[PDB]
Nucleic acid binder design. Structure first.
Lengths: 141, 56, 124, 185
RNA sequence: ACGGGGAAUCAGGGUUCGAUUCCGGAGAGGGAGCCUGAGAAACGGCUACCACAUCCAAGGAAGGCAGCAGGCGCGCAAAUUACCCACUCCCGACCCGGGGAGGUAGUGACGAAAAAUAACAAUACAGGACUCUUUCGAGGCCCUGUAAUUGGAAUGAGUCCACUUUAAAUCCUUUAACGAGGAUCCAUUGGAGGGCAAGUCUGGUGCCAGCAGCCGCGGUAAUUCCAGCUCCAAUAGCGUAUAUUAAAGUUGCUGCAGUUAAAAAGCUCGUAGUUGGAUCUUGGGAGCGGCCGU
């Protein structure tokens, strides 16, 4: 601190209260602008509808096709590109399927190669994409 | 462009069937197997150490 | 090989009950039944085998001790005066009803619909 | 509104750094020396130490001739000597800070079974307790984490319903007897 | 955004949460108005209006689960239309009646505790403290190790007479006889370049497929992909996502920084605000233990 006077409690408290807004992560969680424009609206998972399967071009030196899926959520109708992870798991997903879309890892940030893909697919219509990949369960049709 | 070569490798790598192995002892029994490997058998090794999974 | 050692003995002159906590030491057999319990309480305190009401046993881990609660009364005319209705049902001197509350409550609410003496005819 | 307890706490805390090379060495070295089932079983005894230990920090930093510290402190001292961990002359509350994890684990009945010669190894001792062979003051102890008290040490032998003590044969000793005269005549 | 008791985290300070069982308050679809009564602006009371919705012979009439179950809807997100007044109790005109309040079960990996999945010999044999021999070697006083070699011992899971338990069952405990040798009565979930414990092993793929929190790997020797063995970590658990705490001395009261990295208003005045010089009570007697201490 700077001002140390014994009767300077309201200034030292109120100055922090103002300068705490200049903290990035405070203002993301105290203005509702991030909470508004969070595509899930503060959920860890969200169910949506696969309307198109889109193969995203990997960014810098890593030259590869990142097989993602454009999903439209139930609660919002706000449209989301969700990266389908494992080796040959886009072939479990088809048009107008229900998919449980989780966050990617970095709390609404693009992770690794994939540009602007802030979400990933976990379940493929009540059957998990791990159980389909390991072949412990099958996809209903 | 092309979402056409999805699962190219995993698809056409020749599947080796998982091998019949002796069932590993579980619970305190593993730690007995794990302890008596580490600090009751072995000797001071001149030069730098080998890893437990050091195949050479 | 059974040994009863009665604990915390009290006399209620205001319920007519000599009541004790019964330390049964049975090695190598199961929690001995209330039929085999009370027949030892008869010649433990020179008591008649009617007025002895014993319940709520808890076998200690191992198989060598149960410490449940029982009470011995003055007479059976007092035994009906001051008893749970289920602890008279084990010995067979309080024959309970056999119709449950799902029947009674819907019988009660159909009676609640009729004003007059026509309540007699609604249920059954 | 329902008449239940809910009051439950955690008996261990996991280490912050998960893969310290030398730390994983010691916690594995404690297992073989005392026959424990998992690193959980090591972590809780370090935390029972840490609870006891942290009470001393709250007591040594108090005033002297203090109406709390002399009662509060001399009951912790009374706890640690009865369990057989701390000494009878060194039950002044300075010596609880010089008091390590290996002090508690010898009072573990898993080891008391081993260190009276009524087991063969410390792993065998767990098979005697968890398959209920033993009693302490005529009560069958089924669990190896029985913190044996100082006076309660002289009573540890086999249970009265055990073939390894004074009782009837188990299952296996009867099946060779089942095959014995069953085929003979 | 019900409020507090509290909760999580936590060197010390803090930060964050408190819908939720205890207290106080508010509300019964939204408002409003009342009756009765000691007490209500009552909703398992009424009268409206508004929204919604039910039966109907079209005239009418009845309604309020943010009680307990259940059902639909919404969702990432949540249990039985079960039993009982035996317990805690409350009401009544009452020893008797009643109570989804409450209790007991079903469901339940929200979570917390305890804690199985082997143990012990037997000889092969691999070494080790050691009498002996320079070693190659035997003894073996101490056992130390592992294994589809051979055994005699175990208890639990499971099956189930029988009590016990409790209102009546249940579950645990207790109890029989039946119950373990690939004890198939088969522990997983994640990793194995670095951070970060753990393979320059092989086979495939060849900027592809994919991995990868970050750094990055993959261009035909891939420690990173996909597989085989392998081993590492935690263990009836473990991985992922999201909020949040410590990490953060990267919100700094403790405790940061502003010359050049982000940053001192162009400069001065100035009322709130904050902070403000030294200065007025000292020393003596006296009781006292081993010059000092009370």
């Amino acid at each position: 601190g700077k001002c140390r006077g014994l009767r300077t409690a309201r200034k030292l408290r109120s100055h922090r209260r103002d300068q705490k807004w200049h903290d990035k992560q405070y203002k993301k969680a105290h203005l509702g602008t991030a909470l508004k424009a969070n595509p899930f609206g503060g959920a860890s998972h969200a169910k949506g509808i696969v309307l198109e399967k889109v193969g995203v071009e990997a960014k810098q030196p890593n030259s590869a096709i990142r097989k993602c899926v454009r999903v439209q959520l139930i609660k919002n109708g706000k449209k989301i590109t969700a990266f389908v992870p494992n080796d040959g798991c886009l072939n479990f997903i088809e048009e107008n399927d229900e998919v449980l879309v989780a966050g990617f890892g970095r709390k609404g940030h693009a992770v690794g190669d994939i540009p602007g893909v802030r979400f990933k697919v976990v379940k493929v219509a009540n059957v998990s994409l791990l159980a389909l990949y390991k072949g412990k369960k099958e996809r209903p049709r | 462009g092309s979402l056409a070569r999805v699962g190219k490798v995993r698809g056409q790598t020749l599947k080796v069937a998982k091998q019949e192995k002796k069932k590993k002892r579980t619970g305190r029994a593993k730690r007995r197997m794990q302890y008596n490997r580490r600090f009751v058998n072995v000797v001071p090794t001149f030069g730098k150490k080998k890893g437990p999974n050091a195949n050479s | 090989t059974v040994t009863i050692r009665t604990r915390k003995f009290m006399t209620n002159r205001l319920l007519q009950r000599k009541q004790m906590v019964i330390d049964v030491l049975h090695p190598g057999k199961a929690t001995v039944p209330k039929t085999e319990i009370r027949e030892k309480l008869a010649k433990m305190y020179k008591t008649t085998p009617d007025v002895i009401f014993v319940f709520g046993f808890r076998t200690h881990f191992g198989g060598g001790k149960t410490t449940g609660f029982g009470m011995i009364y003055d007479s059976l005319d007092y035994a009906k005066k001051n008893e749970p209705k289920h602890r008279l049902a084990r010995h067979g001197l309080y024959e309970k009803k056999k119709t449950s509350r799902k029947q009674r409550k819907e019988r009660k609410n159909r009676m609640k619909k009729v004003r007059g003496t026509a309540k007699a005819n609604v249920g059954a | 509104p329902v008449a239940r307890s809910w009051v439950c706490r955690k008996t261990y805390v996991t280490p912050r750094r998960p893969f310290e090379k030398s730390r994983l060495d010691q916690e594995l070295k404690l297992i073989g020396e005392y026959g424990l089932r998992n690193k959980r079983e090591v972590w809780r005894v370090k935390f029972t130490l840490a609870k006891i230990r942290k009470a001393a920090r709250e007591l040594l930093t108090l005033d002297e001739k203090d109406p709390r510290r002399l009662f509060e402190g001399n009951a912790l001292l009374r706890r640690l000597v009865r369990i057989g961990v701390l000494d009878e002359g060194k039950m002044k509350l300075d010596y609880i800070l010089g008091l390590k994890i290996e002090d508690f684990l010898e009072r573990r009945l898993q080891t008391q079974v081993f260190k009276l010669g009524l087991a063969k190894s410390i792993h065998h001792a767990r098979v005697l307790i968890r398959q209920r062979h033993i009693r302490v003051r005529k009560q069958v102890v089924n669990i190896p984490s029985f913190i044996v008290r100082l006076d309660s040490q002289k009573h540890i032998d086999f249970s009265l319903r055990s073939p390894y003590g004074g009782g009837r044969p188990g299952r296996v000793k009867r099946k060779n007897a089942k095959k014995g005269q069953g085929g003979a005549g």
